[PDB]
Structure 1
Amino acid sequence: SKSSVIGWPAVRERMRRAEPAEEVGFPVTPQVPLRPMTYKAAVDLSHFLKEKGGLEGLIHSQRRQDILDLWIYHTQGYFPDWQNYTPGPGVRYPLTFGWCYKLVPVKGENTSLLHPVLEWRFDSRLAFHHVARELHPEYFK
């Protein structure tokens, strides 16, 4: 998770400048091997998010997720479907086996003149006790 340090304030700024509330196609980086976000690398990443900081207790959203996931794919080579969580009813538990963060619910001049949402929670047993599997048993066999 070395080249994930150089965009650790840079992409998070674009996440935080993204509101939590041309181009066509998909390029693939040549000759770089691709793999999903594996278990021990998610253990390597959940501790990378535990140690580098700036993520815990932040306002999670989907626009921030997609800014983040494609940046992992283009700079680290990982399939950007790993940051998937359980839907609306219930705690937004990760479907990813190894992601130890569950999602609980919680510039300035773009406002007009007179005027006429989630967050992380570290759960180290989400890597072993797949709580999203308890929320979705029939999908995981």
Structure 2
Amino acid sequence: XXXXXXXPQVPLRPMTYKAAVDLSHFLKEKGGLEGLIHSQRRQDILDLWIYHTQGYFPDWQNYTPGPGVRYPLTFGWCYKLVPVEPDKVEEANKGENTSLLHPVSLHGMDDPEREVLEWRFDSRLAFHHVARELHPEYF
């Protein structure tokens, strides 16, 4: 998936609804992100790549607080983070060969609400700015 592909050069560009929507699809077309477990290092890696290649300053990708689904502040970004069910986390961590520092093993240390999160793609986010509705304070 694209996280493998990612894992300054270009001039600055503003983040716009068009920018975010195109970007969402650009990542989907390159395969990836959907279903992928969230870790701060991963997003940092992602934010940087977008930043270096496509000149979007890594400030745009923010989500509503937990617990529960975390919704993107930038309108037209079609990726929400949703919490993994506990039983799913435990089954994934089963076994003595799983890496200690793999994102699923961290158990949401990166998250203040300590929830394990995965990226999921939503069509609706392009049409409806869920973050604004839920938290006008941020807007």
Same fold by TM-score greater than 0.5? yes
Structure 1 partner of 2:127? 128
Structure showing greater relative contact order (alpha-carbon pairs closer than 8 Å, 6 or more residues apart): 2
**Kept after mapping to 1: 8 A contact 2:33/2:120:** no
Structure 2 partner of 1:93? 71
Taking structure 2 as the reference length, what is the TM-score of the superposition? 0.68
Number of residue equivalences: 111
Larger radius of gyration: 1
Return 5+ residue gaps in structure 1 as ranges.
1-6, 15-27, 112-116
Give the helix-richer structure, 1 or 2: 2
Give the alignment's Cα RMSD to 1 decimal.
Answer: 2.3
Return 5+ residue gaps in structure 2 as ranges.
85-96, 101-115
Q: What is the CA distance between 1:110 and its match in structure 2?
A: 6.4
The AA in structure 1 aligned to 2:31 is G
Aligned partner of residue 120 in structure 1, secondary structure: strand
| CA deviation vs aligned residue, 1:23-63 (integer Å, no higher than 9, x gap) | xxxxx55xx53123321122112112222212210111221
**Kept after mapping to 2: 8 A contact 1:36/1:82:** no
1:36 lines up with 2:14 in the alignment: yes
- Aligned match of 2:61 in 67, 77, 83? 83
Q: What is the CA distance between 1:10 and its match in structure 2?
A: 3.2
The AA in structure 2 aligned to 1:91 is V
